[PDB]
Design an enzyme around this catalytic site. Structure first.
Site, PDB file in Angstrom:
ATOM      1  N   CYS A 105     -42.939  39.331   4.282  1.00 17.76           N
ATOM      2  CA  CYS A 105     -42.289  38.819   3.080  1.00 17.76           C
ATOM      3  C   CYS A 105     -42.138  37.306   3.185  1.00 17.76           C
ATOM      4  CB  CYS A 105     -40.938  39.495   2.827  1.00 17.76           C
ATOM      5  SG  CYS A 105     -40.502  39.359   1.063  1.00 17.76           S
ATOM      6  N   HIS A 125     -44.846  37.237   0.666  1.00 24.80           N
ATOM      7  CA  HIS A 125     -44.377  37.540  -0.684  1.00 24.80           C
ATOM      8  C   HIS A 125     -45.003  36.539  -1.651  1.00 24.80           C
ATOM      9  CE1 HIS A 125     -41.787  38.207  -4.214  1.00 24.80           C
ATOM     10  NE2 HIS A 125     -41.577  39.400  -3.686  1.00 24.80           N
TER      11      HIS A 125
END
EC number: 3.1.2.-
Lengths: 188, 188
Positions: A105, A125
Site C-alpha cells: 500500500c 496504492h
C-alpha cells in the site's frame, strides 16, 4: 529449520495490512515477530485498532536474521517507517544479505526514503504512486502483487491476502501456500 | 444520527475476522465499540495477535442500543461466545428490537447456542456446518454472504471484506458502501 518473519508496526499503520499477513504467515508455520517501532507499548493503528507488539524493534533487531521483513502500509505508518534510522539499518542489512523485503500500500514508500532496491519493478496504492516515483528510481506496475528480485510489493488492504500468500509461496513454496489458502474461503 | 456497532471479542477469536469489519465500519463513519468478553484486558486471538478492546462488554452493554452486533469467528472464540450468558442477553435483546446481528465463519454457531433467529437462512465456514445444523433449526446456504431478515452471516476469513461491506450497506446504504470500497483495491 523454521523461517522467520519480522513485521514492523508503527503508529498509524493500516491494521488490516498488519493482521492479515501475520495471521496467514503463522498459519504457514512461519515464526512471526510483530515488532513495535517505538518500543513494546501498544500501537494505535490508523482505524484506532490497538495492537500489542511481541517485542520492541530494538530487541527484535538482536534476534535476526529474518527471511522476510514486512512493512505494512497506512499513510502515517509509512511516514514513521520512512523517518526511522533503525528501519534504514534493518532494510539495508536485509538487502545486503539478499533476504526478502515485502511492503504493501503506502509501505513501499519507505523503500525510497531508505534508498532500497532502486531499479526494481514495484507497485503501490494508486494514491502513493507519485510519491514512490519521485526521481524515477523504480519502474511502476499496476499488478495487484509485484515481485522483482527480492522486492515484493502490493497495492492495498484488499490485496492483503494475495500479498501474504505470495510471501508464504516465496518462503515455504507453492504447495504450502495452496494448503494454507484453502481453509480461508478466498474467491480466487 | 450516527450508527453504532458492537463487536464482541473473546479469547480465541479470528483476528482477521475481527479487524477487517472494525476497520471497514469505521471507514464508513460507524461508531464501533470493540468490547472484550472477559473485561478490558488485552485479548489473545487465535493466531496470537493481541488486541486491546475499547471497553469491557459489561460497560459497553450499558451504552446501547447498537444498530448491529458483530460476532467474529475462530473456533475457540465462538465457543466462548456460545457459553456466555451476557452474550445470550445481548443477542436476545437485539433480536427483540429488530436490530441487525452479524456473525462470520464459526461465529454463527453462537446463534444456535443462544436460540437466536431459528428459521433463517444462514451460512457458516464449511467446517462448522454440521454444528450449526444440529436439530435442523436453520436452512443452510453456501453463499459467501447470506442475509435473511435481520440475520447476516458469512463463511470465513476470505469473505471478511464482503461481510463488512454488507454491514455497511445495511446500515448506511449502497452508495456509502461503494464509496468505502473503492480505496480498498478489492478485485470484485
Amino acid at each position: 529449520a523454521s523461517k522467520r518473519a519480522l513485521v514492523i508496526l508503527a503508529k498509524g499503520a493500516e491494521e488490516m495490512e498488519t493482521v492479515i499477513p501475520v495471521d496467514v504467515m503463522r498459519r504457514a508455520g512461519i515464526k512471526v515477530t510483530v515488532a513495535g517501532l517505538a518500543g513494546k507499548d501498544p500501537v494505535q493503528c490508523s482505524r484506532d485498532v490497538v495492537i500489542c507488539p511481541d517485542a520492541s524493534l530494538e530487541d527484535a533487531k538482536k534476534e535476526g536474521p529474518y527471511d522476510v521483513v514486512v512493512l505494512p502500509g497506512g499513510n502515517l505508518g509509512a511516514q514513521n517507517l520512512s523517518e526511522s534510522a533503525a528501519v534504514k539499518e534493518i532494510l539495508k542489512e536485509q538487502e545486503n544479505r539478499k533476504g526478502l523485503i515485502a511492503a504493501i500500500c503506502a509501505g513501499p514508500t519507505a523503500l525510497l526514503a531508505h534508498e532500497i532496491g532502486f531499479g526494481s519493478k514495484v507497485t503501490t496504492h494508486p494514491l502513493a504512486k507519485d510519491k514512490m516515483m519521485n526521481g524515477g528510481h523504480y519502474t511502476y506496475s499496476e499488478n495487484r502483487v509485484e515481485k522483482d528480485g527480492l522486492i515484493l510489493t502490493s497495492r492495498g488492504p484488499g490485496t492483503s491476502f494475495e500479498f501474504a500468500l505470495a510471501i508464504v509461496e516465496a518462503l515455504n513454496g507453492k504447495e504450502v501456500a495452496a494448503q494454507v489458502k484453502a481453509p480461508l474461503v478466498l474467491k480466487d
